[PDB]
């Protein structure tokens with residue numbers, strides 16, 4: 001009986017718009033502006049957006065619900081966090097880790113090191129960011145934070161469709177950001193919302209179909225935000241004037257269903273029949289399955305453990321990179337494979353049964369060594385999970401859990 005990974009979602013402070021525009025609003029628009037009554041955003045405002053206080057409060061709430069806190073995924077919401085002052089960012093993350101640890105460390109590195117064997121393990125850290133705010137520097141900082149997953153605010157993959165954030169972004173930005181995120185071994189999720197102004201159900205469906213056929217994209221998951229008119233927002237005005245008309249409930253539901261119907265086996269759908277990862281969660285003993293698909297000039301290998309009824313027991317994402325962007329310093333070769341995710345259902349492995357993870361990793365190492373002739377494997381693990389990989393011969397190098405293939 002193993003306990004699930006509990007989400008700890010916190011928001012950063014209201015920030016000015018990343019771009020310079022006299023017409024732009026006082027503060028940068030967040031997706032959460034259209035989910036205002038969410039517990040986490042209201043909680044965020046009630047804490048004056050203090051990281052430590054938010055995390056401590058969240059931990060207390062989760063503990064009071066009777067839910068486990070031994071495995072935690074930190075989620076940094078806002079989408080504009082990486083555009084803030086550097087000191088603020090590092091101090092925020094450090095505050096989060098301090099709140100998880102129960103002790104105040106002398107630095108971020110010490111906080112992470114401490115969290116490696118703390119009670120509240122941070123087995124994952126997810127950061128929301130905009131496609132145009134996701135370059136090499138931002139990514140390196142995210143590595144410094146101990147980031148394992150990124151949610152890109154794509155919203156919808158078309159330049160002529162109005163976004164819910166100010167200014168907006170381009171498809172090329174999404175492509176570049178996705179490429180860079182993959183090349184650094186991060187998990188990539190897209191914020192996906194049908195019903196945006198200037199679109200149509202047919203267009204949303206077509207784009208939803210294209211996002212899984214074009215090698216530039218193909219995210220690990222979609223976060224479905226059914227677009228709707230929220231009072232106190234600009235969309236409300238757009239609806240008053242008649243400039244925007246939302247889909248009927250049956251239309252939206254049908255569209256969501258059609259979207260779920262066309263997703264590849266390696267995709268996980270979550271809402272803010274379906275044959276995705278989440279709708280196969282969990283007869284016969286599971287066997288090992290492999291599914292390859294091209295992405296960002298590299299190869300993606302989706303390994304999984306599934307039984308005769310196609311029920312999913314575990315999965316591993318192994319990337320054969322287009323280049324070696326992570327610097328690992330001589331000891332680990334010029335060509336290195338990346339394990340972007342290891343998930344033995346329904347949870348994440350942190351401590352150091354559990355055999356499925358070992359088997360998945362073994363197959364990954366085998367494929368990387370024999371078929372693609374790679375020198376080593378690198379795993380961008382959450383800090384609180386590092387120990388697990390340490391029990392399997394991996395050692396910490398520049399934020400990655402690395403092992404030389406032999």
Ligand code: FES
Nearest residue numbers: 021023024166167
């Ligand atoms: S209002 Fe500032 S960019 Fe559209």
Ligand SMILES: [Zn+2]
Nearest residue numbers: 269274276279
């Ligand atoms: Zn599903």
